[PDB]
């Protein structure tokens, strides 16, 4: 069900990431470096356990989860959140909840590109990843 998402992906476009980071309370110096960072995201599965790695010259993260089962997560900006990842309308939807706040990280495939939409508050960021050659 998630197999077309699997693989190694590189950032090739970013829109409104500063807005998204600022909405989360990320400090200006982190936003500055993040605005010039191009992560590599690796998505692997082993049965219904997915592992999602995000690698860069600045921050690295890794999460493992079962679809539809809540997991604890500590985000790149050090939020301690309750997370769940599901398939919804063919999109990989990651919902994080903490302190009554909600953010979604939604991935979809459009013409072979992986489009990551990040929403928190009113901020909507769209980042595009391409499959490694
Ligand atoms: C691990 C590298 C993540 C992107 C660069 C650092 C951003 C740090 C501040 C914002 C962290 C909040 C949410 C994670 C955003 C992930 C964006 C992405 O996967 O393209």
Total tally of structural domains belonging to the chain: 1
Looking at the CA of residue 79, tell me the nearest atom of ligand 1. 12
The whole-angstrom separation of Cα 113 and Cα 120 is: 23
How many A from CA of 49 to the centre of ligand 1?
22
Q: How far apart are alpha carbons 34 and 84 in whole angstroms?
A: 25
User: Cα of 121 to ligand 1 centre, how many Å?
Assistant: 17
133, part of any domain = no
Domain assignment of residue 104, yes or no: yes
Question: How many angstroms separate the CA atoms of 41 and 62, rounded?
Answer: 10
Resolution (A): 0.8
* Residue/partner pairs of 90-93 with CB below 8 Å, 24 or more apart: 92/2, 92/5
Cβ atoms of 12 and 130 closer than 8 Å: yes
* CATH code of 23's domain: 2.40.128.20
Does the annotation place 129 within a ligand binding site?
yes
Question: Residue 54 corresponds to which tokens in the numbers above?
Answer: 């995000």
Range of the domain at 41: 3-128
| Contact in structure between 43 and 61 (CB atoms under 8 Å) | no
Counting atoms of ligand 1 from 1, which one is nearest the CA of 21?
A: 10
Taking the CA atoms of the chain, what radius of gyration do you get in angstroms? Answer: 14
- Please say whether the dihedral angle defined by the alpha carbons of residues 17, 85, 72 and 53, taken in this order, is positive or negative: negative
């Amino acid at each position: 069900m998630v197999d077309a998402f699997l693989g190694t992906w590189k950032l090739v476009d970013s829109k409104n990431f500063d807005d998204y980071m600022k909405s989360l309370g990320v400090g200006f110096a982190t936003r500055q470096v993040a605005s010039m960072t191009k992560p590599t995201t690796i998505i692997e599965k082993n049965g219904d356990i997915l592992t999602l790695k995000t690698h860069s010259t600045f921050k690295n993260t890794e999460i493992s989860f079962k679809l539809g089962v809540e997991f604890d997560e500590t985000t790149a900006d050090d939020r301690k959140v309750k997370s769940i990842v599901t398939l919804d309308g063919g999109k990989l939807v990651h919902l994080q909840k903490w302190d009554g706040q909600e953010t979604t990280l939604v991935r979809e495939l459009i013409d072979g590109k992986l489009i990551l939409t990040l929403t928190h508050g009113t901020a909507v960021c769209t980042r595009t990843y391409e499959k490694e050659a």
